[PDB]
Design a protein around this ligand. Structure first.
Ligand SMILES: Nc1ncnc2c1ncn2[C@H]1C[C@H](O)[C@@H](COP(=O)(O)OP(=O)(O)OP(=O)(O)O)O1
Ligand SMILES: [Mg+2]
Ligand SMILES: [Mg+2]
Length: 539
DNA sequence: GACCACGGCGCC
DNA sequence: AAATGGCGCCGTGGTC
């Protein structure tokens, strides 16, 4: 390519090099652009950023986030990663995509721009003819990247002092727990070392081993195993408490306060757009899609996530989303009738499990009930269900008998999906998002059956993802008009920030947009709450 | 210091 | 642990 002076012409493809992968924290080391047989290299990349109308290229969103960090409205445009990802969601990295579609991902901006230009050419050609993938790119993925860029740049406010205070409290309780364990062991050891724990539990103490680990064949010390051993010895219960507290301290309480951005004073995640096999987003650096919610300590952590002064959080969460999708994809009339007649399957299982009427079902019971229902749906063994519910095989068999008898045409949809996947090599969502599942014809039953479970899950999970993404696309411009913000997505939930004065309006509008995103044979239903913190906003 | 595999576990 | 699926992050034990 001819080296042309900087500034590029409109529509040029950008390439850029960051000191590190997180656009909110990175130094923009270099910036280049490519169009029509030329390459343009910025002498000063931060100043050169002002000349662009849009970020068009590989990882366009990341550059746009960094532009917003520096107060510039540079929205993301075409990204060959999004094209590769729609063709095959195993196309998740630029290293991989380049090798596949005609180049090499280097560390140099010029080359990254030229790569971006020619990869877009090649991948656009492959998507021609592929009209439904094309609709997804134009109407969902491409615009969603702009919405995510704004979410990432905005961040969420965290009560830092609270979390630091909470750390000292939890440290003390941890000391109490580890001291009891060592007493019960007759000696100290590193309780964070599962190998050392294995020896204590199974060699030194008498305790029976329940299972083995996958790769290396060690006697497992997992929560599942420890739960089964909970009466065998009093040490076990302390180990479970120790595990709870150290997980949350080490993953949430300690790291989060140190990730406050100095300019914003807020916490900034990355919403990864080409990371999953089903079309979901992921969140990383810090993952804010797995903030605790079950246990009392987890809930205390969730309270740290707060509204800006004089604003409120609005949390919107789809009700029984994948079940409703399943009713639509399958056409099971009994299951459609459940949702038209306004019944709640998670509470019905909860009342069954704990043996109490629906009026008396609490948060924990209902949560527990969700594992059971998605566990069973996506293929849990009788054996395993008998374990978690703590009942016999006969009983756990009989649960999974009725579950699927209730809803005849689910199994029929499962089989049609499996057959189509075997024939074409891929399965798809309601909108034609694909996942290639090659092992449906494997000769090893276990490999074949795992592949089957992945294959029938994807249309369901991915359709919910498609819906939520489309909902985000539609909702974002409406929020800007109202002076509200989209903060977080947690798969089937959204968290928004609204000025106090407008929070009720925002909530009503966001709920309608989410319920009417794309009507189905069953109604989509959204639960909404408003509060000063994340926990209160779904209380 | 970086990275790796693993077992383990937080959320949907 | 186990015939649920989809993620990312932590500490250990270990390499380079
Ligand atoms: N344990 C699980 N196994 C498989 N899929 C799950 C599991 N938990 C959650 N999911 C998937 C299926 C859910 O429909 C989807 C959204 O999560 P979630 O909001 O917690 O449940 P839900 O939408 O079905 O019930 P709720 O009415 O409480 O919102 O994520
Ligand atoms: Mg939900
Ligand atoms: Mg949810």
């Amino acid at each position: 390519l001819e080296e042309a002076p900087w500034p590029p012409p409109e529509g040029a493809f950008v390439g850029f090099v960051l000191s590190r992968k997180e656009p909110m924290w990175a130094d923009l080391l270099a910036l280049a652009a490519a169009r029509g047989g030329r390459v343009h290299r910025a002498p000063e990349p931060y100043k050169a950023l002002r000349d662009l109308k849009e970020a068009r290229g590989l990882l366009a969103k990341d550059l746009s986030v960094l532009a917003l960090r520096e107060g510039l409205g540079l929205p993301p445009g075409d990204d060959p990663m999004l094209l590769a990802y729609l063709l095959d969601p195993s196309n998740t990295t630029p290293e991989g995509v380049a090798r596949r579609y005609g180049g090499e991902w280097t560390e140099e901006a010029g080359e990254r721009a030229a790569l971006s230009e020619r990869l877009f050419a090649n991948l656009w050609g492959r998507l021609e003819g592929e009209e439904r993938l094309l609709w997804l790119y134009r109407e969902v993925e491409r615009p969603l990247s702009a919405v995510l860029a704004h979410m990432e740049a905005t961040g969420v406010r965290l009560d830092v002092a609270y979390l630091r205070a909470l750390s000292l409290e939890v440290a003390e309780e941890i000391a109490r727990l580890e001291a009891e364990v060592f007493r019960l062991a007759g000696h100290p050891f590193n309780l964070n070392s599962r190998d050392q724990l294995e020896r204590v539990l199974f060699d030194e103490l008498g305790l029976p081993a329940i299972g083995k680990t996958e790769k290396t064949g060690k006697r497992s010390t997992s929560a599942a195993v420890l739960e089964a051993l909970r009466e065998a010895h009093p040490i076990v219960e302390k180990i479970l408490q120790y595990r709870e507290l150290t997980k949350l301290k080490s993953t949430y309480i300690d790291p989060l306060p140190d990730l406050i951005h100095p300019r914003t004073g807020r916490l900034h995640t990355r919403f990864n757009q080409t990371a999953t096999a089903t079309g979901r987003l992921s969140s990383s650096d810090p993952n804010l899609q797995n903030i605790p919610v079950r246990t009392p300590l987890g809930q205390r952590i969730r309270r740290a996530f707060i509204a800006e002064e004089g604003w409120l959080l609005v949390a919107l969460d789809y009700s029984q989303i994948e079940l409703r999708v399943l009713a639509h994809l399958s056409g099971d009339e009994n299951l459609i009738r459940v949702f038209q007649e306004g019944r709640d399957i998670h509470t019905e299982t909860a009342s069954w499990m704990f043996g109490v009427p629906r009026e008396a079902v609490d948060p924990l019971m209902r949560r527990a009930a969700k594992t059971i229902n998605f566990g069973v749906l996506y293929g849990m063994s009788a054996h395993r269900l008998s374990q978690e519910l703590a009942i016999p095989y006969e009983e756990a068999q009989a649960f999974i008998e009725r579950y699927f008898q209730s809803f005849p045409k689910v199994r029929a949809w499962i089989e049609k999906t499996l057959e189509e996947g075997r024939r074409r090599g891929y399965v798809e969502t309601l909108f034609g998002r694909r996942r290639y599942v090659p092992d449906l014809e494997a000769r090893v039953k276990s490999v074949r059956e795992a592949a089957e479970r992945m294959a029938f899950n994807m249309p369901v999970q991915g359709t919910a993802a498609d819906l939520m993404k489309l909902a985000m696309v539609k909702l974002f411009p409406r929020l800007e008009e109202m002076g509200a913000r989209m903060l977080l997505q947690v798969h089937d939930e959204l968290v928004l920030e609204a000025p106090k004065e407008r929070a009720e309006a925002v909530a009503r509008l966001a709920k309608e947009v989410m319920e009417g995103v794309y009507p189905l044979a069953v109604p989509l239903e959204v639960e909404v709450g408003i509060g000063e913190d994340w926990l209160s906003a779904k209380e």
